Amino acid sequence: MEQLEFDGLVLKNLSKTLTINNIEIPMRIKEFELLWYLASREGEVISKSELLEKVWGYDYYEDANTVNVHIHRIREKLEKHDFLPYTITTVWGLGYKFERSR
């Protein structure tokens, strides 16, 4: 898959950019790759460990809590640009999942 669409949110993996209502939203590459990994697995709860291993596999991190920080950054950007119908749900202690809101 090169492109995912979720009611107005479009993820473009070739360019590692994202649009909301066809407007590009600045996002760093790690944040995009995290979002892409989750949205590619809509509805699946992905543990911090799998995210660190498969999204940061090559990049380094002092602190596993870089995952949480990045989840928050993604949700802040979606929320700030009034994107409501999909979000990343935190499943406490278990992981994160991209899914329809509620």
Domains of the chain: 1-102 (1.10.10.10)
Q: Which residues contact 29 (CB under 8 A, 6 or more apart)?
A: 16
Facing residues of 23 across strands?
Answer: 20
Is residue 16 within 8 A of residue 32, CB to CB? The reply is yes
φ, ψ for residue 14, nearest 5 deg: -55, -50
Query: What is the distance of C-alpha 93 from the center of its chain?
Result: 18
Cα dihedral across residues 67, 5, 23, 12: positive or negative: positive
Question: What is the residue whose two structure tokens read 């407007």?
Answer: 23
Say how far apart CA 42 and CA 39 lie, in whole Å: 5
Q: Per 3-state DSSP, what percentage of the chain is helix, strand, and coil (rounded to 5)? A: 35, 25, 40
Tell me, in Å, the resolution of the deposited structure. 2.2
Say how far apart CA 9 and CA 11 lie, in whole Å: 7
Query: What is the distance of C-alpha 89 from the center of its chain?
Result: 10
Q: Determination technique for this PDB entry?
A: X-ray
Task: Give all strands (DSSP E) within the chain, no chain letters.
Answer: 3-6, 9-12, 17-20, 23-25, 86-91, 95-100
